[PDB]
Design a binder for this molecule. Structure first.
Ligand SMILES: CCCCCCCCCCCCCCCCCC(=O)OC[C@H](COP(=O)([O-])OCC(O)COP(=O)([O-])OC[C@@H](COC(=O)CCCCCCCCCCCCCCCCC)OC(=O)CCCCCCCCCCCCCCCCC)OC(=O)CCCCCCCCCCCCCCCCC
Ligand SMILES: COC1=C(OC)C(=O)C(C/C=C(\C)CC/C=C(\C)CC/C=C(\C)CC/C=C(/C)CC/C=C(/C)CC/C=C(\C)CC/C=C(\C)CC/C=C(\C)CC/C=C(/C)CCC=C(C)C)=C(C)C1=O
Ligand SMILES: CCCCCCCCCCCCCCCCCC(=O)OC[C@H](COP(=O)([O-])OCC[N+](C)(C)C)OC(=O)CCCCCCCCCCCCCCCCC
Ligand SMILES: CCCCCCCCCCCCCCCCCC(=O)OC[C@H](COP(=O)([O-])OCC[N+](C)(C)C)OC(=O)CCCCCCCCCCCCCCCCC
Ligand SMILES: CCCCCCCCCCCCCCCCCC(=O)OC[C@H](COP(=O)([O-])OCC[N+](C)(C)C)OC(=O)CCCCCCCCCCCCCCCCC
Ligand SMILES: CCCCCCCCCCCCCCCCCC(=O)OC[C@H](COP(=O)([O-])OCC[N+](C)(C)C)OC(=O)CCCCCCCCCCCCCCCCC
Ligand SMILES: CCCCCCCCCCCCCCCCCC(=O)OC[C@H](COP(=O)(O)OCCN)OC(=O)CCCCCCCCCCCCCCCCC
Ligand SMILES: CCCCCCCCCCCCCCCCCC(=O)OC[C@H](COP(=O)(O)OCCN)OC(=O)CCCCCCCCCCCCCCCCC
Ligand SMILES: CCCCCCCCCCCCCCCCCC(=O)OC[C@H](COP(=O)(O)OCCN)OC(=O)CCCCCCCCCCCCCCCCC
Ligand SMILES: CCCCCCCCCCCCCCCCCC(=O)OC[C@H](COP(=O)(O)OCCN)OC(=O)CCCCCCCCCCCCCCCCC
Ligand code: SF4
Lengths: 172, 157, 83, 72, 49, 318, 70, 98, 115
């Protein structure tokens, strides 16, 4: 229960490795969905649930549209997965081996640098308000409605101008 | 006999009960006999009451009711959708056309009975057989697959 | 105008969803500007005590703040109790 | 002779009451509700299903079934 | 009322097949518990109502 | 004891799903002037067990063109997400008490859509591809509209928890203040659960079977269980949100009974709707949810932003 | 007739009342005659942990009243 | 937290490496961009949760909003590329050298 | 811990069901059994070919609208603020801008499907 966050971070690294290795975009979207779920779990473990659930929902919608698009136009007769190419699968297992080697090197040589296996699970939650109401992560995002109205208006104008932009690009 | 033989017989009874209480035909028909087949589906006879429910895909089908004239142009398609059904599958030929060609037996473009193409479990005679007769054939098929002794034959192997 | 009313009736007959949507939008815009309870929502949210009221050091120079919670002085919530 | 199945004769003009009726029809799904009511009536009816093989559908003496050879 | 009359018809259909064993026999063979006038019985043992 | 609680949640939900299949057969039959299953068992009550046993003793299909990994992964994913969506519902006490319950519900529903999509793509068939693309369009439309609906309702409620919804409806149903968005939420749940007229993914007449046209036996059973568990799930969510059952602190059995009765009524309404209406065309579903529901949903969202402000009825944080 | 649906409806009703009633009873049994405490905020979680430390049996639901005060 | 942040930084580095090392699929390049975005979101969110910076908690949502606008415009451009060529091949997108 | 436990129990249950579904019945598979289904005839072309999308603009709009949903979702905590006038004005502006974008796309026929 100490290395739970580290296991999640390693799974996120593996998912990003597969996404970098670039299979067919169906499998790329699958890896991105798994990475988004893992990142949601990481934000959940580190603190408020709202940011993790938000990025989860956003990436579910995004990879849904991506799946529709890759079935539309970014497809091939034989879609390429991680196991179809010997070079891609070799790069996958080599990246896993390199990750294990790098975390062992940072455990041994660098001592307490970025990775410490003895200190793992000790520095996840630094300071928490033991007694207290109004502490959850969604309240800051709510404070965007009051404290950062400039942030609110630039986000809203980004979405509005984006609607106009996509209409003009796909106007044809 | 042996105690394990009794257990195997009871397991055979249970499997046969499940397979005969759940018989899903493919949504497949060719002619007037298939019109009588949907008249069996109609509220008077209620194949759904008997537990018999049409499924469109052959993958979810258990039985295939060949209801109509199997032509030469249709025979590869009929064999294909029969082969795509999973293994515990049965065939009910319906009407004189599917049985032995019927009124088109001496035609250049008619397969003289669907038993030349697929192995037929039960033949239902008529032109068309009534929905009563097709329901009778379905119940006779239920009795036939109640008679099956697969685990008992496997044990006696 | 007669033509404006005829267009509005035609819209209400043929596309009532948009008429209801625009009417609800307008009502949601104009209703807080005319309701007398609008200040009460902000006052209730201000009166909700999410944080501890940190006491102030009394130098004997402010007479307005109460010495005890059960004192007549201070922001009482009788308006909320009778709201 | 002939008749029209979908052609409408003249116009009903525009009225506030008629516009409100059409608005309520569109918004409150009135024909969908009465279709639901029709299916509900059928639910509370009696089914037309006989108990085969213990009950058989009616036939006539003219019925053509299995062949047979008779005698004097 | 008529609901109690329906319940009377139901309880006579339940207790009209001989006993509990006869009710279970007709209910698990014919899936039907209606009471009818016995028209006859053939030489093979079929009852007709 | 927690594992026993898991069992007494999971197993009765599965049995209620199977008897929902039976009750759909019976209700559709009696609305179609026939009887439905009454032979297999006393009154047909052994018919779902017969169907389950037949499907689990039929061989599965492993087509040559089919991506085996995603073909296997999709139905177990669908069933797991159905049970996971069932887990946090309060009746009146949830098995897992969450703060952002409806956000968990939305995430798990979208992941179930992904299970449908991956099944359709893995089963390398054109009808499966049609089912996947129709699922994409359907979930686009109902996702945006249902998200705004739930946002407005919980703005009236005040928090994302569901015991808070029980406390909100302690005195009155939310159907009375929020009945237009209750109707739109009901249609959204129909489209989410892929029920007629918005099924469009297991298209019986348009396609052959759609996304599960290559699935047979066991995995097909998993898909069917997931779908009907989602039916009971979404109707239970609808009656928790809008038709608040009577809650008393001294006895929660009254709440459970009232919740059961209203959920059964809503599920029977689903079967009633399937009997009554013909199927939409899947572009008409998108046009409906984007041209009629969505503008009204935005207007009502603005109205429910304004309403506690000018009525001073801002809901409590807790 | 239409009342043949009622056996399946009753089975569904029993299978729907079982999870909520059983969950409430299991919560009451595992928390000792009281409902399971909800810690939606850190203050409530701190209250639960303080009760667990106070009880002396490492169970928060064992409440201590005025018998611990002289 | 430091091991987690190092792993997130390496995840961003891998996604950037994937973006910089093209294959035939522009959609795969856009997916690598979205992976970079996801790593940035998770880093910002865990930093805000670790430092209790509720004032800076709107920043990850703003990142998601602008990045989704980026992804939307990328999908529109991929639509135009596929209408031009029939595929999303960066090897087809090459005729501006002269 | 409890949520993780029940998720794992669901995973184990579904894996057990699919495992017994694949290892319990008798296997008999051949070429015509596992050929893809095209209503009785051979498929003319592979199903991995490009398959045109007539609602792509609506999908991009769905991305933008989903992010508008993400912006609108902290409202149940935003209504607890002291300065409710600023929150109300900002929420009204956001929903009105979203509605104006939808109306502009509807006017410019972006909601209509191509061909
Ligand atoms: C769960 C069930 C798994 C096994 C399913 C199965 O029967 O596999 C058949 C398999 C035997 O192969 P086969 O059936 O002869 O070949 C046909 C298969 O369709 C051939 O399989 P395919 O066409 O489905 O392609 C498999 C392919 C694609 O499948 C997957 O990626 C599935 C796993 C997703 C996770 O997997 C790989 O290439 C290896 C992936 C290794 C894990 C991913 C590591 C990098 C990404 C990290 C993030 C992942 C998210 O065992
Ligand atoms: C005139 O010209 C012509 C035509 O033109 C008109 C033709 O058309 C034509 C072709 C003609 C035909 C093919 C004839 C076909 C007939 C018809 C079209 C009419 C029939 C009508 C219909 C098909 C409509 C039917 C409508 C309904 C509402 C019926 C309901 C049907 C359904 C599919 C939905 C119900 C679902 C099922 C039956 C399956 C459900 C059950 C399961 C999958 C079980 C799952 C459960 C589990 C796995 C649970 C397990 C878990 C547990 C815990 C259980 C515990 C277990 C233990 C053992 C303890 C011809 C030839 C023709 O010439
Ligand atoms: C929870 C919901 C799902 C529940 C699933 C059902 C649970 C209860 C299952 C009870 C029955 C278990 C055995 C089912 C066997 C089905 C397949 C079958 O009959 O195969 C016959 C075959 C017969 O094999 P065989 O040796 O005769 O030859 C097969 C090959 N041919 C015919 C081509 C020559 O296999 C068996 O008999 C295996 C018996 C296994 C018994 C396990 C207990
Ligand atoms: C909900 C209704 C479910 C079905 C009820 C029985 C159906 C048959 C009723 C009789 C009939 O045919 O009426 C046709 C009639 C329609 O006949 P009509 O089509 O001739 O229209 C009348 C004429 N104009 C066009 C002017 C209205 O229905 C009505 O008059 C009422 C329909 C609208 C009201 C009901 C639907 C909207 C309800 C929204 C709020 C939710 C209510 C509570 C739900 C609680 C449970 C979830
Ligand atoms: C859970 C609670 C109960 C929910 C309801 C459950 C029972 C009823 C179920 C009925 C069966 C539904 C099956 C699926 C039907 C699918 C079709 C469908 O619904 O289409 C939607 C139809 C679509 O209509 P349409 O598509 O026919 O219209 C044509 C539109 N064009 C031309 C643009 C294509 O209706 C709606 O969209 C209306 C949604 C509800 C609106 C409610 C408005 C109420 C009034 C608001 C306030 C008005 C006053 C404002 C203030 C004034 C002040 C002066
Ligand atoms: C119970 C069903 C599952 C099962 O038996 O799986 C075993 C699997 C099943 O593989 P199978 O597909 O050959 O199963 C036999 C056929 N049916 C399904 C009818 C039983 O393996 C075997 O039975 C043999 C493998 C080697 C066993 C070596 C000795 C083990 C002790
Ligand atoms: C077939 C493969 C399937 C893969 C996908 C699996 C999907 C699972 C079901 C859908 C999950 C959707 C995302 C859920 C994320 C967590 C939601 C949430 O809000 O959790 C918060 C909650 C407690 O937080 P809060 O509500 O704030 O309460 C604090 C005070 N009570 O709870 C917590 O904080 C608990 C944190 C952990 C919760 C998630 C546990 C997931 C377990 C792993 C599943 C996958 C395992 C790997 C694959 C196995 C082999 C296939
Ligand atoms: C599902 C399983 C099977 C069904 C299970 C439940 C069965 C319930 C049976 C008893 C219902 C009793 C309803 C009232 C009967 C007495 C009566 O007076 O009925 C007539 C009345 C309409 O008479 P009228 O004067 O024309 O009314 C005009 C004003 N509305 O009628 C009314 O006012 C009707 C009011 C109720 C309408 C809905 C009734 C059915 C509810 C469940 C539907 C399930 C569908 C699936
Ligand atoms: C490090 C930087 C250099 C990495 C070189 C990798 C090999 C290479 O150049 O691949 C080119 C390839 C081009 O794309 P493609 O169309 O697939 O190529 C077909 C081949 N003509 O490119 C690709 O396919 C993109 C590959 C992206 C891979 C991202 C993840 C890499 C993980 C391993 C990193 C390197 C580890 C080296 C370890 C050495 C020993 C300690
Ligand atoms: C402030 C702005 C935001 C307010 C909140 C509501 C948001 C609504 C967003 C969408 C609005 C789009 C309106 C313009 C439009 O695109 O109309 C198109 C529609 C005809 O298009 P279509 O539905 O496709 O018809 C099929 C072909 N005949 O055309 C029509 O239906 C014509 C509609 C005419 C009436 C417009 C509304 C009048 C309201 C008066 C209220 C008085 C009180
Ligand atoms: S046997 Fe007679 S009724 Fe049946 S398909 Fe042939 S011609 Fe038609």
């Amino acid at each position: 229960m100490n290395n739970y966050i580290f296991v999640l971070s390693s799974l996120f690294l593996v998912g990003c490795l597969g996404l970098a290795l670039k299979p067919s975009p169906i499998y790329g979207g699958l890896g991105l969905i798994v990475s988004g779920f893992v990142g949601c779990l990481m934000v959940l473990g580190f603190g408020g649930s709202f940011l993790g659930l938000m990025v989860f929902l956003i990436y579910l919608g995004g990879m849904l549209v991506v799946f529709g698009y890759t079935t539309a136009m970014a497809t091939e007769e034989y879609p390429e997965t991680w196991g179809s190419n010997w070079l891609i699968l070799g790069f996958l297992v080599l990246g896993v081996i390199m990750e294990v080697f790098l975390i062992c090197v940072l455990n041994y040589y660098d001592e307490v640098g970025v990775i410490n296996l003895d200190g793992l699970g000790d520095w996840l939650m630094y300071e928490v308000d033991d007694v207290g109401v109004m502490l959850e992560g969604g309240i800051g995002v709510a404070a965007m409605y009051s404290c950062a109205t400039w942030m609110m208006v630039v986000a809203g104008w980004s979405l509005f101008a984006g609607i106009f932009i996509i209409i003009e690009i796909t106007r044809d | 006999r042996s105690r394990a033989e009794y257990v195997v017989t009871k397991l055979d009874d249970l499997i046969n009960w499940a397979r005969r209480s759940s018989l899903w035909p493919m949504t497949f028909g060719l002619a007037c006999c298939a019109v009588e087949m949907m008249h069996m589906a109609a509220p008077r006879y209620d194949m759904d009451r008997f537990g018999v429910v049409f499924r469109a895909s052959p993958r979810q089908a258990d039985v295939m009711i060949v209801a109509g004239t199997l032509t030469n142009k249709m025979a590869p398609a009929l064999r294909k959708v029969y082969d795509q059904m999973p293994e515990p599958r049965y065939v009910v030929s319906m009407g004189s056309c599917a049985n032995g060609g019927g009124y088109y037996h001496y035609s250049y473009s008619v397969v003289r009975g669907c038993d030349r193409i697929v192995p037929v479990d039960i033949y239902v005679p008529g032109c068309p057989p009534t929905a009563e007769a097709l329901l009778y054939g379905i119940l006779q098929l239920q009795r036939k697959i109640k008679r099956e002794q697969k685990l008992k034959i496997w044990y006696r192997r | 105008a007669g033509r404006i009313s005829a267009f509005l009736k035609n819209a209400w007959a043929k596309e009532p969803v948009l008429v209801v949507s625009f009417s609800v939008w307008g009502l949601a815009i104009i209703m807080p500007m005319i309701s007398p309870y609008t200040k009460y929502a902000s006052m209730i949210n201000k009166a909700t005590p999410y944080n501890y009221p940190v006491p102030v050091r009394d130098d004997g120079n402010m007479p307005d703040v109460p010495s005890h919670p059960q004192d007549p002085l201070g922001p009482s919530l009788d308006w909320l109790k009778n709201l | 002779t002939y008749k029209y199945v979908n052609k409408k004769e003249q116009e009903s003009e525009v009225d506030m009451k008629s516009a409100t009726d059409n608005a309520a029809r569109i918004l409150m799904w009135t024909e969908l509700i009465r279709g639901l009511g029709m299916t509900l009536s059928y639910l509370f009816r009696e089914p037309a299903t006989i108990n085969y093989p213990f009950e058989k559908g009616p036939l006539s003496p003219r019925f053509r079934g299995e062949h047979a050879l008779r005698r004097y | 009322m008529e609901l109690v009359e329906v319940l009377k018809r139901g309880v006579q259909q339940v207790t009209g097949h001989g006993g509990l064993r006869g009710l279970l026999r007709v209910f698990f063979r014919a899936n039907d518990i209606r009471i009818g006038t016995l028209v006859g019985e053939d030489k093979y043992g079929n009852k007709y109502y | 004891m927690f594992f026993i609680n898991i069992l007494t949640l999971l197993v009765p939900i599965l049995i209620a799903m199977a008897f929902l299949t039976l009750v759909e057969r019976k209700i559709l039959g009696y609305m179609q002037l026939r009887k439905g299953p009454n032979i297999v068992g006393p009154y047909g009550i052994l018919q779902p067990f017969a169907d389950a046993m037949k499907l689990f003793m039929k061989e599965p299909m492993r087509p040559l063109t089919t991506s085996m990994s995603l073909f296997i992964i999709a139905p177990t994913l669908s069933l797991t997400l159905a049970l996971s969506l069932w887990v946090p519902l309060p009746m009146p006490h949830p098995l897992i008490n969450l703060n952002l319950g409806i956000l968990f519900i939305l995430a798990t529903s979208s992941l179930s859509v992904y299970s449908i999509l991956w099944s359709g793509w893995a089963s390398n068939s054109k009808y499966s591809l049609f089912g996947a693309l129709r699922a994409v369009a359907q979930t686009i439309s109902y996702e945006v509209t249902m998200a705004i609906i739930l946002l407005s309702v919980l703005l009236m409620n005040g928090s994302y928890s569901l015991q808070t919804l029980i406390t909100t409806q302690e005195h009155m149903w939310l159907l009375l203040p929020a009945w237009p968005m209750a109707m739109m939420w009901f249609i959204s749940t129909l489209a989410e659960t892929n029920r007629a007229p918005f099924d469009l993914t297991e298209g019986e007449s348009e396609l052959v079977s759609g996304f599960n046209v290559e699935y047979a036996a066991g995995p097909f059973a998993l898909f069917f269980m997931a779908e009907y568990t989602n039916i009971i799930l979404m109707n239970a969510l609808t009656t928790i949100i809008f038709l608040g059952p009577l809650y008393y602190i001294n006895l929660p059995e009254l709440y459970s009974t009232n919740f059961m009765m209203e959920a059964l009524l809503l599920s029977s309404t689903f079967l009633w709707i399937r009997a009554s209406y013909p199927r939409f065309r899947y572009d008409q579903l998108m046009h409906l949810l984007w041209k009629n529901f969505l503008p009204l949903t935005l207007a009502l969202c603005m109205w429910h932003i304004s309403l506690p402000i000018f009525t001073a009825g801002v809901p409590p944080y807790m | 007739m239409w009342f043949e649906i009622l056996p399946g409806l009753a089975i569904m009703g029993v299978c729907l009342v079982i999870p909520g009633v059983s969950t409430a009873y299991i919560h009451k049994f595992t928390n000792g005659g009281k409902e399971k405490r909800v810690a939606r905020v850190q203050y409530q979680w701190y209250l639960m942990e303080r009760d667990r430390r106070i009880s002396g049996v490492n169970r928060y639901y064992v409440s201590k009243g005025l018998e611990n005060i002289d | 937290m430091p091991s987690t942040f190092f792993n997130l930084t390496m995840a961003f580095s891998l996604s950037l490496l994937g973006t910089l090392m093209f294959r035939s699929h522009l959609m795969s390049t856009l997916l690598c961009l979205e992976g970079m975005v996801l790593s940035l979101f998770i880093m910002t969110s865990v930093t805000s949760l670790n430092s209790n910076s509720m004032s800076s908690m709107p920043i990850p949502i703003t990142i998601l909003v602008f990045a989704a606008c980026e992804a939307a415009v990328g999908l529109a451009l991929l639509v135009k590329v596929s209408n031009t060529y029939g595929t999303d091949y960066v090897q087809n997108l090459n005729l501006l050298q002269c | 811990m409890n949520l993780y436990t029940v998720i794992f129990i669901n995973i184990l249950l579904s894996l057990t069901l699919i495992l017994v579904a694949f290892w319990l019945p008798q296997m008999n598979l051949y070429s015509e059994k596992a050929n893809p289904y095209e209503c009785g005839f051979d498929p003319t072309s592979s199903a991995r070919l490009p398959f045109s999308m007539k609602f792509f603009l609506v999908a991009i709009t769905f991305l933008l609208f989903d992010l508008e949903i993400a912006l609108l979702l902290p409202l149940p905590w935003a209504i607890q603020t002291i300065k409710t006038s600023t929150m109300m004005i900002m929420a009204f502006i956001l929903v009105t801008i979203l509605s104006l974008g939808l109306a502009y796309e509807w006017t410019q026929k972006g909601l209509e499907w191509t061909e």
